[PDB]
Amino acid sequence: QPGVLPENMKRYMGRDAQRMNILAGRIIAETVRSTLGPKGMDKMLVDDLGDVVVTNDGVTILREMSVEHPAAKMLIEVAKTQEKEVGDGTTTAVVVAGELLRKAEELLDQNVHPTIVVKGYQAAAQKAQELLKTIACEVGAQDKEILTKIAMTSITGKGAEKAKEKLAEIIVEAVSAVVDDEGKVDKDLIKIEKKSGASIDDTELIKGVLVDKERVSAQMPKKVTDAKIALLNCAIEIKETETDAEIRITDPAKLMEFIEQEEKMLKDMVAEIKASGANVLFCQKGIDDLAQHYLAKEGIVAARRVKKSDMEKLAKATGANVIAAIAALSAQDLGDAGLVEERKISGDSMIFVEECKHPKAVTMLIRGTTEHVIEEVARAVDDAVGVVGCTIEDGRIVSGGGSTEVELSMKLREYAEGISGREQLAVRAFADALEVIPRTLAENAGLDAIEILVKVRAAHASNGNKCAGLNVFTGAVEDMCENGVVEPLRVKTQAIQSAAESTEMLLRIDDVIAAE
Amino acid sequence: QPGVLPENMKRYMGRDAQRMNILAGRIIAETVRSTLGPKGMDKMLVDDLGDVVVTNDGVTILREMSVEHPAAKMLIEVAKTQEKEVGDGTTTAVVVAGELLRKAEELLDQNVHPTIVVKGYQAAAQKAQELLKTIACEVGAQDKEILTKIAMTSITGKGAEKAKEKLAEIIVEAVSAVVDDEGKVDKDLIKIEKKSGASIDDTELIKGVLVDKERVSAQMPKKVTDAKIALLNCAIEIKETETDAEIRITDPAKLMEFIEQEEKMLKDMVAEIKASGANVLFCQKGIDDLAQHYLAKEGIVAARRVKKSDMEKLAKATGANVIAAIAALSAQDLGDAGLVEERKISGDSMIFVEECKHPKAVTMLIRGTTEHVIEEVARAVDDAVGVVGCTIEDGRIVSGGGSTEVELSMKLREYAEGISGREQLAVRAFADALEVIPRTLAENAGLDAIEILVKVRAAHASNGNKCAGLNVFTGAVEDMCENGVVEPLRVKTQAIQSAAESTEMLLRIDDVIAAE
Amino acid sequence: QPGVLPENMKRYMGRDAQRMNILAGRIIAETVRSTLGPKGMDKMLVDDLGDVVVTNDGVTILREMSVEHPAAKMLIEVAKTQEKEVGDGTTTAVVVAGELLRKAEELLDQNVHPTIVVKGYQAAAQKAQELLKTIACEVGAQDKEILTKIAMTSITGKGAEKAKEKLAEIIVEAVSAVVDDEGKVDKDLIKIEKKSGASIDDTELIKGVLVDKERVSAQMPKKVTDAKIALLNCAIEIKETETDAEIRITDPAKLMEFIEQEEKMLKDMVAEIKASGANVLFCQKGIDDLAQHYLAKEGIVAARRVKKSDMEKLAKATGANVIAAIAALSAQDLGDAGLVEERKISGDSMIFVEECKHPKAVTMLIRGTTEHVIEEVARAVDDAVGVVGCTIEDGRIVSGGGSTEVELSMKLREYAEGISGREQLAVRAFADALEVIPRTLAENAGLDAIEILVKVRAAHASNGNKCAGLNVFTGAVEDMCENGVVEPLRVKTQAIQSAAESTEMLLRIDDVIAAE
Amino acid sequence: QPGVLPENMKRYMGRDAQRMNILAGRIIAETVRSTLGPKGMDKMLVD
């Protein structure tokens, strides 16, 4: 009378704390597990507003569930980071982390101290990163045949039926276009546009951008070839001074002198824009209705109040400078595009700026029969852009289908031999955890994981094939590299590192104190 | 349209049902785990009425918690059965069952099918039973030394402090004395009485019984040596007919003639009791106040309305025959006892019938300073009576301290080699599960289970020493047989068979359907 | 204006009624599906009282999940009758039923009228009963080797591990023993007692009965060899006239004269029982406290107030006659037993009447480690007893493993060829339905049902192994009759007829009117 | 598992829909019928 710590709190100590964290992780892991690989299935998620999401995407599934459990939230972070650093393998990272917790339980139930488990996992993770470097194969950032296999593998992971060669080719062309002068890929430089239509095969790559604006005046050309584009962020209105300034009029005559003076400078603004040679204009602010007319007379296509995000993208695509002062508009600020057309797409009117030659931003136009069908294709397209860009930046790949994990697993066991004592148990555990991937690939495929795993493990033993993996379609062990089943080194290195760091952090916890 | 199964129910399928049972099992095992062994600790259980139990007794703890979880209830049954068939090792049984469930989870996580683990478990258990037979030593039903070591070990299992030589010797004598013609032991022939007093060391064995009664008339002797005892099933009251009868009196004088005839029937009943040579009498029913005087006038001690259970044991102890008709009574129906005394014990007035020559029932009078202190001594005396009972009936024992489980474990692994493919994993898991006993023993002793196992395991290898186990005290591996740490074969055979059958039953479950 | 049909009613018409019924049926079928065959898994059913049921038994499951849906109730009835008429194959009957509903929906969805579906179903069923007759093998009522296979097969269906050669032989001996002169086998004559113990292998057959009672006086022998058993349904007390009667006493001396005449009436009742030759007495009503004495002084074992249920079974076993009047008790009315002994079992004392010569009632004493494990063995025994009885009664059997179903289905397609009209679609559908069994057996075994069905069909085509079926244990198509996997003809004929009649009934419904 | 069409709705099919409309139609006709012609009568409507 009374208590020290609040009366309004739950608390779980020792083995109870370890259990609830481990359990929470394992359950999260098991939620996305059934989505892994080609034979994986999809979730349909519905929120409280009744909006639905149908996806095979690990991190998407995890964000869309209202997971409130604290240890679970920690594992979701593993996915969010995989999405951010790589753009693919979010399910893998989560499932590996889950396996690491499970494997840790069996050591904690022998009374191996948690710090020792932690020590072992840390040692194993580091060795794994060293091993991954020797396992990876080098590739050039210009190796299109290879980049296209990277994209194919990625799209396949979301079901073989989406893995179009056309689609993969488009994607490779798109990432290639936006590679910068330092060799980095910014995935935002690829505008993604989603428009219902006849078929998914209608998805196309636009050398330029799509703007959701109609041209300001119908008297303007709907179409213009080899255009000279002008980007303004200043308003084409009568300029007012920043200082408070009022006009005073005493002479009835001078009433029209001020009106005329205003419209004479508008006519002078347009005159200035025409003078620079531009026949197409995108303005961020507004355009006085009279200037609209004046622009139209000269046959200049103009669109108004274009959002910042679009402006910045337009400049990137045509090589134009977003100019802030009309007077300062010279003809070297004009971008250049093959075709600029106002056109309808799925009943929506939009301005297409396309057929640019050396564009620094491009647009994936994704097509499909229905919103939710399109939505998942886009998610697939996002994965593929991720891993293609990773490959272009790193120039390292590994074979897929569980082959890299098995090789890695097999090398870590060898490593475990030379570890003295109890830490060794943890290192074996870490090694064995990695096989959750090849096992999960086979389960989802309906095959028998135990025997499959013996077969693959055998094709890896003593100078075998590091590329040996199960082929879920034929049911055999094959050279996954010779089959074009490949993925960026970054997917494995990030996923393992994330898995190791988050589980190590959870495994150090011996006390949970929750309020409310 | 409505549902088929009632919408008023929770259902758990596949992995979920499996985790539900397996988890509920383990948790139930983990609650009793800290009681195991001489260095185990006690629970204090408080119910809804505020009544309290403090015990180290496995099945008592499990019974006294009001467990609702269906899987948990299935394991509690294992404890209940161990109590009934053996009377000791309830905690061992359950902790082994829990471990079998845990070891089974590792198998199910690898996609070993439930029916296979069940198969392997069943094989391993059958083999364990066969090994247990070769492992056991033969002893004689009358080997006081070994029996005494059996009792001592049982009582140590509830703390070395309770294990006084005096107490084990009392118990061995108690059980020995109630063994019947066929060499069987009826726990119920040994009456337990609990009375507070100076000390637990005051606990004594009575070659007789304690009857919760006072002699009916204070005029009667309260001490009788070399007593001749009569046991009556009929009441010493006026006898009436079953056929409805009634007296008609028309003659004033005929009053006293009836009163005096009823008064004479009594004097006759007593006079018949006298003739048999009896001087002490126990009547299951009532004695007419008037007959009480006549008995008193004759110097015959008598108690009225004796609990039939008391009559049944008085008979067992003294050699008397419970007689249902006074006329049939004869000196041959009389029992014998060296001392019948009415005296007070901790303030309660009772009759001791003691110093009987060859009693077929006896009384453990358990003493202690306080009610709850006594209760636990009692529970400890029950475990001991149980195992001495088993040793007398079976004449087979095993060494303890985890030695036998380790030996089994070591040997079942040798067996598992001959098993082909996949069942093998289960068999090896069963072997591994038994090591939970030596592991738990040592962790409760504050020792390091992992290295202790390595040491004990070594002492068993290369045709070593089946009796080797950890001494929770010295902290070293010793010969438990030389240390007198021994237990009935039936303790292990029941425990393991119980744990095997119930987990097998639970492992076959893939759907849980719960109502309300 | 005020509404005709009540306003509380729910109504489903046409398509909606058909789908409601057809769905409810399939759902019920699906909940027992996972239990079918040797690789079947069990369900755990909890009720609103916390009471638990773990079983593989189809009808037991369906009965215990308190199902409300009307269409589903109709299908439970199929299981209940399989149980009454046969004792095994309750899951098979329900699963076939569900399948017939399913195949009916594919026909309904092509606008085949329900009456036509009904008509085709009836024809296919009738033809199946004629095919089944030619498919069965003749068998001897006393061919133990075959009966034992029949029993072995029944027990395996509830899991391999319960399939003991020993258990099967016991069961055959038990059924064989109660077969009456006409050759009919009444399940009720085989009493089932359940008592915890060392293990399931401790299950024994008693040629006789167990009585839940103790002898009335300890003075009576606790064990008698080659016993003469009297069974008296009247009470061994003083007889009272049915006409109201009362004694008048007027002479103080003629007081004892009545007591003494009642004491002589008991003594005589006993003397007459002894003159029968009887040394064991089971009485249905009470036994006067005093007569209990005279019985012991004559060395007669006597048990009082034995329930009418047991008297009847005692008489059936020993060859005795329940006598209503001690007077007319002759040496011919006594039954004979090799051994009558009162002993303890699971710590409960009972009277064993065993080693009878020609028992027409017997006892399966079932043993297991825990209550809930025993329960399941008991059902396994119930099933085996059923089908052993069916074989003895019928003399016709078929091969298991879904083999008879495949034959039946292949032949029925031959029959369908020569049928014209939409009717043909319903018959061919009835044929296809049967294959739900082989399919479900394979699926539960983790096998691939489609190709396995392809192989089994092939082994049946063009004369032709009717006994060919999939061995879940090897994964190969084998000769089930040479593998010993056999079952009574009545299992299939009852199941199929049940499934056909109830679904035909359901298919005729176009309107459901539920109230409240 | 839940319903497709919202459980918060009444539905009338086949003959029932037909009787519903046909009846609601006739009743509406029958309320104004007594006004028809020179010998028709008036309504008093109160809101």
Ligand SMILES: Nc1ncnc2c1ncn2[C@@H]1O[C@H](COP(=O)(O)OP(=O)(O)O)[C@@H](O)[C@H]1O
């Ligand atoms: N053709 C293939 N055969 C076998 N495995 C494949 C194939 N294509 C992709 N995979 C594997 O599927 C996994 C990725 O599957 P996916 O469902 O996209 O999960 P994640 O969200 O973790 O990327 C990787 O392990 C990859 O090796």
Ligand SMILES: Nc1ncnc2c1ncn2[C@@H]1O[C@H](COP(=O)(O)OP(=O)(O)O)[C@@H](O)[C@H]1O
């Ligand atoms: N002196 C001892 N040294 C080591 N182990 C012992 C000793 N005495 C008893 N044990 C072990 O303790 C275990 C039983 O402990 P106990 O707490 O009574 O549990 P249970 O309820 O299962 O009998 C057995 O393995 C027994 O061999």
Ligand SMILES: Nc1ncnc2c1ncn2[C@@H]1O[C@H](COP(=O)(O)OP(=O)(O)O)[C@@H](O)[C@H]1O
């Ligand atoms: N050894 C076996 N191999 C293959 N099938 C078997 C074997 N034993 C039994 N069966 C099949 O199992 C089915 C019985 O399943 P069961 O679980 O008993 O449910 P039920 O008898 O209640 O329908 C029958 O089709 C029988 O042919």
Ligand SMILES: [Mg+2]
């Ligand atoms: Mg992927």
Ligand SMILES: [Mg+2]
């Ligand atoms: Mg003990």
Ligand SMILES: [Mg+2]
């Ligand atoms: Mg069956």
